[PDB]
Amino acid sequence: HAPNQALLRILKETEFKKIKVLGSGAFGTVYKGLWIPEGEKVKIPVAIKELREATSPKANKEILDEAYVMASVDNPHVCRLLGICLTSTVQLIMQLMPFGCLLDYVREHKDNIGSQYLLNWCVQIAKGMNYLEDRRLVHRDLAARNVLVKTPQHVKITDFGRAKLLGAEEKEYHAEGGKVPIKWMALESILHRIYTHQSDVWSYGVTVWELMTFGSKPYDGIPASEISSILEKGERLPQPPICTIDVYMIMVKCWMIDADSRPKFRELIIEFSKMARDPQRYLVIQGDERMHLPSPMDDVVDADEYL
Numbered sequence: 001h002a003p004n005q006a007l008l009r010i011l012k013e014t015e016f017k018k019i020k021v022l023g024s025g026a027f028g029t030v031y032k033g034l035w036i037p038e039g040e041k042v043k044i045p046v047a048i049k050e051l052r053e054a055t056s057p058k059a060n061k062e063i064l065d066e067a068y069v070m071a072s073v074d075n076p077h078v079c080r081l082l083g084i085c086l087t088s089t090v091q092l093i094m095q096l097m098p099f100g101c102l103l104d105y106v107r108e109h110k111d112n113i114g115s116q117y118l119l120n121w122c123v124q125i126a127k128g129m130n131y132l133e134d135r136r137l138v139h140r141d142l143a144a145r146n147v148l149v150k151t152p153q154h155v156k157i158t159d160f161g162r163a164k165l166l167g168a169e170e171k172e173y174h175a176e177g178g179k180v181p182i183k184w185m186a187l188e189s190i191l192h193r194i195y196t197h198q199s200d201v202w203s204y205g206v207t208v209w210e211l212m213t214f215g216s217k218p219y220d221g222i223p224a225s226e227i228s229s230i231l232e233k234g235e236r237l238p239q240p241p242i243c244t245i246d247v248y249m250i251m252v253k254c255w256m257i258d259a260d261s262r263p264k265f266r267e268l269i270i271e272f273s274k275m276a277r278d279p280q281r282y283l284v285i286q287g288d289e290r291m292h293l294p295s296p297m298d299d300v301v302d303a304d305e306y307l
Ligand SMILES: *[C@@H](CC(=O)Nc1cc2c(Nc3ccc(OCc4ccccn4)c(Cl)c3)c(C#N)cnc2cc1OCC)CN(C)C
Pocket: 022, 030, 046, 047, 048, 049, 063, 064, 066, 067, 070, 079, 081, 092, 093, 094, 095, 096, 097, 098, 099, 100, 101, 102, 103, 104, 145, 146, 148, 158, 159
């Protein structure tokens, strides 16, 4: 198949500044900062991940494989890697997404999120996923926690730590063991470790459900080990209070046992987009019409305008 001609940019440590810690994990620390390429008179808001010293050879390998994947995607609804830096520990430089993860955003701003935003986000995530399908990439971890918010009007899919580029002739990815987000996974993934674009569609439905409930936990209080039999008995997540049957039927279709009967991402774009043209017909939110969310140094330029 086609040669992957993505460029991987190796950055110089003196070209970026850490301004503030965003978060700390077992992997390393994420900083908010600025990337200032020498002589270009530009300043790019970035998230910088610095791996800790104690990082194993195995962990470094997985981080570099994820970097390889992020360097190979280029779409307005998929997060962009600016580059990496090979200091004592590896640093990864991504576009800053100032409003954070979408799961938190909907929990924290629920009294101001109207139907127009919710449906637009559905369109955008469907576009990101359709692009990934075109690239023969299966994400395997789609969820509201893994969507980032550049502005309230513009979201992007992130976290390619489980993502697989399907082999040239390969139709499905077969996984081995590992720690899995059961409650977002298609039944064939839980039972048989099979992943396809159609299994990502299932996860998309669950992600939509998260948004429409303003960040409820799916199958809340139910242990992960009971999920597969609940699903086999035909039970699914409930209709969110704000959803018309039009929107709920779409989620339900994403949760069919027959993977080939689930909608395609290209059809999800179309359907949510029809609804986005008349949003109050499809989502019923009290005070919808009065809801407002935020909207937009000298040489600052967003990563999206730095090409
Ligand atoms: C959600 C809160 C939250 O997401 N906070 C954030 C996060 C970001 C991030 N996130 C991020 C993710 C991964 C990164 O690395 C990428 C990588 C590349 C190659 C190999 C391995 N890993 C980095 Cl560096 C960052 C980014 C990015 N990218 C940008 N901006 C963020 C902002 C932000 O909040 C700002 C208010 C909380 N959970 C509970 C759901």
